[PDB]
């Protein structure tokens, strides 16, 4: 049989993960990507499935998750390496038939164990599986360095951030007429940050940490990547604009409105006030 | 018989696409191309054609394009998989026998369509075929960031943008000495914006789209790509600059028209009479 | 998503068709391999699904393979060729919900149709599964050389054949246990060869057709190649020690027995018995 | 790090039975190799060892042994195969400090054992590290295909078939100077056939099987290799001979002992008294 | 045997220059990385050990360093040049019994030596041996760009310096808790500014060296390559926002407090203080 | 024979070519690049000699250049397209026996020519030639970004570029200690321009050509390519430090004098007296 | 500098000992090449020269020889690896200035010493220079399988192993139109086989060595394998036609003389008067 790494989904997880590190959105462990996966893209390949499944208990219940299979990348694992060794960075997971915890199917060699921000990823899924009635199925979180520099610059409010991104770049607004939820700074690696970041998720497709990246949601690896690029090529012309002595003219709230009208989509209320 | 993915103008596409992907100019789907194409370049490759060839109605009716072929990027499609998957992200149209609308030959698969910028790219083939006597046979669009961002800081004028870019590089007079056109900021994906830019395209090679991107035409994919190119490293230049407080010696009136003498070339006036 | 041509599945084919084209096993069109799937197989990959599969009655009826999907060679076809463009020389059908036929799901492009012998792989199929219970998964067809050029010059019995080729190497008694059963020579590609070679695999995995090569069966794609590959290499020792006289020496009555016990394995009475 | 498949006994691994493949000696999972290790050819990769070890006891006691690492080709395992999944095909064992038996650290992944021609591996490096003083430290077993037609025609008896091969290729004598030994039928995979096999290793380092295979012992993986390939050439070259009448000239124990003296070897004294 | 070229070791030096130079912090010759090895690593490379191997006295004794092999790269060599001729580029070697010198074994070809901040390399290490209890085995130079150009902007303290790298990403407090420290500019290539590194080097893991580069010490070629890139991501953020006009807001000192805790981490006293 | 292609000059050739394009210096046919060999370097390489070689006169007599052969650029052609079609591109051209003008022994199909540059590019090897005792072999031009746009924002002065390039990066005073050269901003491609180059070249290794780029010599393309790169990694470390309100501290001139002295290099005065 | 690895030479000898190992024409050591090189083509390459160069007498003088250079297999190398390690199985070597000895400039790494063979090679290198006025410049041997065979069956007769071989294949007069000389079976690597085959390259561009293999001549590596491959071919030809009972019809005596004419080559005068 041809080898799990060869398979879809782990070749969209090195190519994910790859793309991200090129970007240079990913120095040293920087960022962690799950995948929501089916049994059908898992069972042929049996053959490389840990004879004694590592079991780990879940930071807290989730049983809409139930029974669920994810592949992961690992705590303290470099994107720049998924390419490499896939097995020693990745790690498909399954959630037991309670919600409780999970067992390492595949991966995660040399005991890794999934990224620390599963909390963030797992509470996330699961309020975008609710709002999406289960079309999205990917988190990605990256160190997106202008979307990080601006969160010392511009105000870290959901209304004003929104807005300036979306007059970024034309295609903002319509990639992501929900906006973007900004926390205020928290420890990372915590159920706090993650509840706070799967609160956000009801609303938005797109989360930003201070001083420390973003989150995003999607459909699939592509789109998720894509969601979270689209905020950055805006964010990377805003830090231009901004070391040019800033906007002198820019998109206005009539073309905005404009724009969603011709898309069919209806923009976060708050930032089209502005 | 060799695969048509393996055709000059699919991999000249793969290039030209996989090269604005690297370059940052092409976040998700942003940008679109457009190829012209002879009935001689897709002779040989007759058992790739669908057996059934979609048909779709042209946004308004285009005589002078009467059964002419070409290969267009698809709708939300991306530059970065165009390598990974052709079939599945470019396509062969040709325009029936009175312009009326085309048959998608080859790709697009799985339903997809051409680009939601089609309007723009045919009415701007059309006018350049008009301009150039058939010489130019290549529509390119993408998120060319430093342009993008002088669109913020800049004034949005014909005149004052393409002498800016002039003096960005020494080779811009020469490599578009008619100049780049602006539009005032529309919604993009219409016939409305697809009309202003083949109006400008009657003008000048390059036309840019406000907090959005720019559009260009050439003989080849590789002389638009570096047309683009060109006046992108120059916009690039121009924003290293104007982050270092401007311009305190430049490339003055009197040196560009030495330069549009010494390369045979008339400098597009309003810019020059600044 | 990673296109069809990606999955295991379709990597299989092209592994098992290019060894056996670098044997010297398929000159132009010859063999044909046909490989049973789950649903589960296809599921991620309905992106590649053509949108109005082709349906093509079968030669008859066979309601114990309704709506079993498969990925089969194309009927002349190169095996040379699998590797270099798969969709074009490989296909995957789903028998309907009754057994009377199928639809082309991906693949068999510009209207190529599944093998010839689709009958033979079917049927075999079909019989392999009642003796097996559902573990052969596998029909695969070759003009294997040796094999061939043994079929004039052997007596074409079932037994005398089996024994000959348990003969020309240590494992082959216990890799084919069951022996190879030997057909009278038949117009290829009927319904008639193809009802007599499933008819042989109710009691072998191996079937040669006189002047023609050999059809065997198997779980895997690699069981499959190596079932043939081992008759076949058995085959050439053969071949040299012919032309070298004949045999001198060989592998006797008594050690065939104590190799089928060590084995564990009961081979086919009337090639022990000779 | 660097993972273990990288390591230069991986490698090496590879490299000899991917090309022992391309020869045709090793259809399906014919043959098997070993290669004799050290602590620090493995110490850089402990990232890669299993965590729980599994252990299997040696068919008998092998103190000589003890604490002794090992690479190890898989039962049923194709030499095909190798280079595709080197963890699923191959695997390090790491005999016990008593000789008991062995802990598999790495590969033989889903349950895989070694070769079931284990016995005769090891049975013979320990005869060969007494015989050698330790410069041997391979044992390769393979399907040569001319040295098993060989078996039918030729007396199965170490002096006649020695000089037959020394004839066959002038470079022989001086390659396997002490000549190939060659054991009567037995069943394989058993510990008779692995001690008889050690045994004639004590004296040879090519040892055949009638009817099935050859076996050799050097001081690494290339020379062992090079060792078989020798005497299968000379075999191959035989084939044609014999297929062409037989010698009507050959190499004469007059020349076969000028080769001796020039090469400081002493030639097998049976085989050279024929 | 597999040349030494294929080594863990080589193979990482060449994955550590190639990326250090995909990431522009290595122009021409600039940077320089040694990596501390042991005899178990370079023993089964024999082979490629030079004859004669050359020796070259070390700037000053350095006993705690007897008989250690490193792998190292050559003075006035490039980065970009790593991969595609190791041993032109570099060199293993070993210093001599009572620290006095080193011999050459291998690479370092056409006569070139080891980098000319060889002191500073070897003070290094051997005062990160003191201080991790030989956990690190790494020391790595290069100019990042970032953290040069905002060593002529920000004041050349370690407490300042530290605090803001802190500020920059918010991982930073917990890959580097022990903060950089600062020299002040010095003649690069001495033993003086080797000194002064290594007595930075007891007690922080990042130094830098203003107007010039950044040096980093870690367990493996990826932490320590890692180390850095986190320090220079950080930087490129800093850079970006006071091109912005500045801090608006940043990292608290009570966050950076809070953060440390979660991580168990102690930060730098003097830092923390600001 | 091997192709001229794979000779060390056209591997060098596309080796730099193509860094540069990597490096964004070589936008569309920005840059051109010259390199001087001997009859040695192309003796082997006859059967790829047109059999007509084309004639062109040179701008005018060099006799200092007689009888040498070179590989050039081409007009018009992209750095990126060298690793593509290195005869499309390149040209290999000999100055015949008086330096009136050279024939195109390979290369430059389709009728291209030398580069535009190609007075100043002959102009400056015959001055670097006489300088340097012949040591120097190349000449190479590109747009290199950083340095461009500093041309609009520091004085234009010889002396003041100097010591500027010289502060943003250690290593400039050791790698360019006869400092950079600035010409008044010129119609470029002229003899003109071709002779102020020339010129600056007596005295400097690099010379500025203001709002365009570039000249550099060196006697091996790493050499050459590593000194622009040094320049240029300097500029934009400048451009860095000038978007953040420029120099809070620098390399002084003492500090200058004491690298200069252990270096063994002596500083141009002009700039060191600044 | 590129390695002298990819140069013309190197690069051609990599692919003659490969083309040869996949003939099966070469176990282990089996063969030994040697060209002849010009000062010209070593002249780039310096820096890959061996600083102390190893001297090694030469087992006779040979003056003719003086001076000149050549690339040479080593002694007990595997022709397989040449493509793997070139510098480990082949050398450069040159003839000092009296005949005496050479110098090994480059390869023959861990104190490899040229093939055992080198007095047949070196003494036929001369006489070929001689009958040729210096156009053959290569010499190669290898275990040719079917001439092997061959020489245990005709009569080891320069005339009738001539004509039989150009009876064989059509070509076979028009390429070795002087035949083929063979020698009485002689201890192989010795002076004596040597001068024999030296004596016969006289005469004859062929040579076989009974019981061993073929030497060929030729001015470049591609026309001496291709004349060894031609002859080859032949053999090939010949074993499976006395494999099926000899000549029925075969090229008379007539139509050879009719071929030498149209090709204006004239035979070999004894074996056209067989
Ligand atoms: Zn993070
Ligand atoms: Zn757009
Ligand atoms: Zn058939
Ligand atoms: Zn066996
Ligand atoms: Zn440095
Ligand atoms: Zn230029
Ligand atoms: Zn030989």
Not at 8 to 24: N, P, R, S, Y
Not at 86 to 92: M, S
Not at 136 to 151: F, Q
Not at 223 to 234: N, P, Q, R, W, Y
């Amino acid at each position: 049989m041809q080898n799990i790494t060869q398979s879809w989904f782990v070749q969209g997880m090195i190519k994910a993960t790859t793309d991200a590190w090129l970007k240079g959105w990913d120095e040293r462990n920087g960022g962690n990507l799950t995948l929501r996966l089916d049994d059908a893209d898992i069972a042929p390949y049996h053959d490389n499935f840990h004879q004694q499944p590592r079991y780990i208990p879940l930071s807290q219940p989730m049983p809409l998750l139930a029974n669920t299979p994810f592949i992961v990348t690992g705590s303290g694992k470099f994107f720049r390496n998924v390419q490499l060794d896939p097995a020693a960075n990745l790690g498909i997971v399954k959630v037991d038939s309670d919600g409780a915890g999970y067992h390492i199917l595949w991966g995660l060699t040399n005991e890794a164990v999934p990224t620390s921000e599963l909390p963030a990823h797992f509470l996330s899924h699961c309020e975008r599986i609710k709002a999406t009635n289960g079309k999205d199925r990917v988190i990605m979180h990256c160190h997106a360095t202008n979307l990080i520099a601006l969160t010392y610059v511009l105000e870290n409010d959901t209304a004003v951030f929104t807005r300036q991104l979306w007059e970024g770049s034309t295609e903002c607004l319509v990639v992501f007429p929900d906006g973007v939820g900004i926390l205020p700074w928290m420890v990372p690696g915590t159920d706090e940050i993650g509840q706070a970041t799967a609160q956000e998720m009801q609303k938005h497709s797109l989360v930003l940490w201070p001083f420390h990246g973003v989150f995003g949601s999607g459909p699939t690896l592509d789109e998720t990547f894509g969601l979270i690029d689209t905020a950055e090529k805006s964010a990377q012309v805003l830090v231009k604009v901004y070391s040019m002595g800033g906007m002198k003219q820019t998109i206005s709230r009539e073309e905005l409105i404009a724009l969603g009208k011709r898309f069919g989509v209806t923009p976060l209320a708050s930032a089209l006030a502005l």
